[PDB]
Symmetry: D2
Subunit: 297 residues, 4 copies
Amino acid sequence: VGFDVAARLGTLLTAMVTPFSGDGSLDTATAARLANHLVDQGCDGLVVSGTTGESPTTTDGEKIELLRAVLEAVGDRARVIAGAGTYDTAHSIRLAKACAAEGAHGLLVVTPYYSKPPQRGLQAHFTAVADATELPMLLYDIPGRSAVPIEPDTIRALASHPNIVGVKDAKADLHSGAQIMADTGLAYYSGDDALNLPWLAMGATGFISVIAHLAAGQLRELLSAFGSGDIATARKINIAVAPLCNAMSRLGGVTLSKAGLRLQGIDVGDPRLPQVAATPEQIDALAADMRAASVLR
Amino acid sequence: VGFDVAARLGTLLTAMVTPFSGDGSLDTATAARLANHLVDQGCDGLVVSGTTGESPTTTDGEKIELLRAVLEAVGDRARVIAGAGTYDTAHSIRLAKACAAEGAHGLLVVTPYYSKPPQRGLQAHFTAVADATELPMLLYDIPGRSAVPIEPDTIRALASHPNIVGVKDAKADLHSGAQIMADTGLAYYSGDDALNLPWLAMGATGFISVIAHLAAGQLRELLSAFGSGDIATARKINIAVAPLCNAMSRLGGVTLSKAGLRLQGIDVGDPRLPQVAATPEQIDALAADMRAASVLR
Amino acid sequence: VGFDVAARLGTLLTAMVTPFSGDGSLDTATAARLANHLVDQGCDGLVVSGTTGESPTTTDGEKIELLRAVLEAVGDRARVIAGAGTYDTAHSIRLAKACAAEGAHGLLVVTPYYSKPPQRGLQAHFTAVADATELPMLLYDIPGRSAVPIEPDTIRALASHPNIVGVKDAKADLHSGAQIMADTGLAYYSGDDALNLPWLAMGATGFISVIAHLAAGQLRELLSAFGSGDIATARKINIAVAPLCNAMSRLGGVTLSKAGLRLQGIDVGDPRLPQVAATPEQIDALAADMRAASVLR
Amino acid sequence: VGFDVAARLGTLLTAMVTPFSGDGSLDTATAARLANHLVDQGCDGLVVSGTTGESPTTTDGEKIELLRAVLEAVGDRARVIAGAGTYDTAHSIRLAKACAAEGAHGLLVVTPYYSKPPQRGLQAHFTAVADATELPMLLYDIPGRSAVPIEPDTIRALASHPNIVGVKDAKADLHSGAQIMADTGLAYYSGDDALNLPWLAMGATGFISVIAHLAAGQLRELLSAFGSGDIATARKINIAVAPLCNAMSRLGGVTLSKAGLRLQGIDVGDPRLPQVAATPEQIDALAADMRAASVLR
Ligand code: NA
Ligand code: NA
Ligand code: NA
Ligand code: NA
Ligand code: NA
Ligand code: NA
Ligand code: NA
Ligand code: NA
């Protein structure tokens, strides 16, 4: 009205892993160093306690404890987004309020997973979560993980809420997303690194990326080259970071980002169970893809 | 060695809804009345805080608070199984221990959902959960909800753990389940009412049912008729309760069981968000199926 | 009215491979020897030019040429069913008429594949195919191959046609098939060997089997043991032939049956392209499963 | 070497419907008028007897009969591509040779459908089809219809054949297609109108389109605007023709193009069974989308 999601939330965001100490405890120090690193590499925004941040296995206290550690570290020169979504509506209301109290710049609310609620339950869920805080709220539609999509009718109905300002899409329905962007003006962020460039063509605002952990610089130049009309360079850069997308397919984001950051000298620990760290064979394969993406050696 | 899952855990179990007061609070009183009702109707076992018990939206305290309320009510003449599974391994370890401390007769551990861990993460997860307690542990394989299956190799590896004694299957891979039963001797329970009779033919031990909320008597006679070789009667009874399976397809288990119990005079409240209670049109459709199953009017 | 599909079409049918000479020509002689073999092993019916009979790669002339070769060989003591289904309605009308002219005992019409017609196109298709001949017509519902299912409403509408008498189900919707059998009285045949026993429990009439090529005797005893109420023996026999179902999963029916028959001394040739014959590694794996099923060595 | 697929086969191709007379006969006259219309509207290439051309329900003679009618009509100022793919390798060899004898400019070979051959069968199939003619051959990968994909390893192996020059992709794996284009230099054509613009961003050469039947002019300007770096105009035009993509989702290409052409004054007949023509309700919905795309009234 007129909100600017590009400035409010960013254009190159990394869904940051939650670093853990050698014993498994929350490592606030490694979080700030990685937060400064990702911003210094080209990220104007960060998502904390997203999917890749191991939100399933971190407590309410550790989430707020991480949120301030990232805010005081990079909150001056970068936007900080807190993931406040569970399969529990009342819990999501407390998390979004507490994240608001700590001064997070935005909210990322994932589709309630596992329980497979009907669409009107999802609309009532998101409406209640968007009511809890005057922060800008991003819809996070990932049916491959949550077992239900946000249907296009549900997204359009929630588009009229003043706090719901955009969608982080891991559904890959580019034709539907392109029409929702044009019709309602919601800002779309690619929640799928493999489709970053197709999403820009559809009109997306930016990336809430995973391989930005290891290649935020190239992704920044991809966004720059696409906005400046040089599509051949964005495609050239997208082919360059393609091997990191292949490695994410083999490993998944949590295992990839933690094993990849260690090979870049930035040890962030190992994932909490039921997630596991990369095997030696997976590490060597990850490194070959990273040497292909010119982000190793 | 030789464990008897049929006696240890039961043969007709209802994944009991968690009743809620008119304000949304945990209703321990309605839980006992429903627990006595389900046992008096033919259930020799009960599952508390399963999928249908709205485990996503109930606290750790409310789960233990419900567990004792059901144990003191029916624990003498029925087996009580506590669902202790999340996408958080350490949380599942605390829940399974606390449920053990309260004297639950068994554990139901669902495949970690949403985060999509690899198979070796699942094996390490379940192994750590089975280590936490000498209770008999049931695997709960529902890839339609959790977004990952327990592969047959993973089930067989976990079959050698002394506490993992069986599988609640909502995967419908009857050919694989039949071979796992024959090879490892794990007890299978139908986690899909629509496939109750096909599962008995494959060798299942019983039902961890949802429509038993409304038709536990007929399901008991189905198990009786099948064990006594009268397959035509079990099939006759399965056709009789088929409309309740159709209604579960339209509504889902949580909405169906709560709306259905109210129409049977046993008001248990409404589901917690993001789940919703049945609409008037859904209630009238549910009633027509229930009148077809001869469990209404 | 009252038709007896069990006598009209059979109870143990093999979707017979179409044998080919060493040069790829139609081998009528090997067809009769295999037809006599399958009947002498326990099959009271046969399907010619089905999916496993390589209907995609055989001409109209070779189909009729095969139909008479099987009729004169076993048509006295066995039922012969001709597959007359393509994605071409008018072609299916000529094939079903010509198969009728040659005295086939029934028709097997597959869901038109590839072109994905809407349901009313399917209903109009099957209605026109059932009109062309007063032979008993079997619906063949295999959405995994044809890319569209026959919805339950379509099957029920086609159930009132006097020539459409049953369904060969490769859709695995046991709950829907059980209700269609009870409501309309259509005869169901398992088009999925892995679900043969679950289909009997649902009320199926028999098997239109693939692994019967190699284990028709055991399947006959499975049908006998299930009809005589001995479910534990049918399950014991189903576990015995389970390795052949695993091999069919790896290879597919055409490659499995031709490579398996050669190892049983009954060489029937190699499949026509785009299908291929088993590799040496696939042959050795097939043999290990066949030695497990006690149908080799 | 260096082939120019953009000139050899075109950049805006319409998979042309096969027009039929009022009695169902092949209408060569309506084919030429539509062929001249589509070229005069901006199509530099045409595909005959593709999926949308009702290849399942047209004879070998009618296909060649249509091929010459389109060649003599527009073969001077447009490229004509003949679809020569079935689930029958030897049949595909005769069709591709006969289409070559009639002077078609290229071949479109679809993945063998229904029979689900393994990958090495597909590689051997396409290799044998590419051997039959020195025409440029386009791979057509549509697993949603054919029930098997062409795996990326299969496409790369077939990329070294001199006659296989590109891929018509209806698989939507933009990340894989982008890497195959960069690695092997195969020309990709969007076989999915909804993903036309994402495919251009990935580097596709053009569209083998369906909604070009009704909006070839706008699609031409979309290709022009994208090649000239004006991405915002291509996206503006893609949103304009989006309602035609929605109508194709409801109807399918054969029903949409024939019902849509009639509303544009160019009656081409009705589809052959098992396909059906649009219902009055479907016609009115199609017209509303066409009035939205500014291609009606
Ligand atoms: Na959707
Ligand atoms: Na919708
Ligand atoms: Na599995
Ligand atoms: Na496995
Ligand atoms: Na169906
Ligand atoms: Na239907
Ligand atoms: Na593929
Ligand atoms: Na591959």
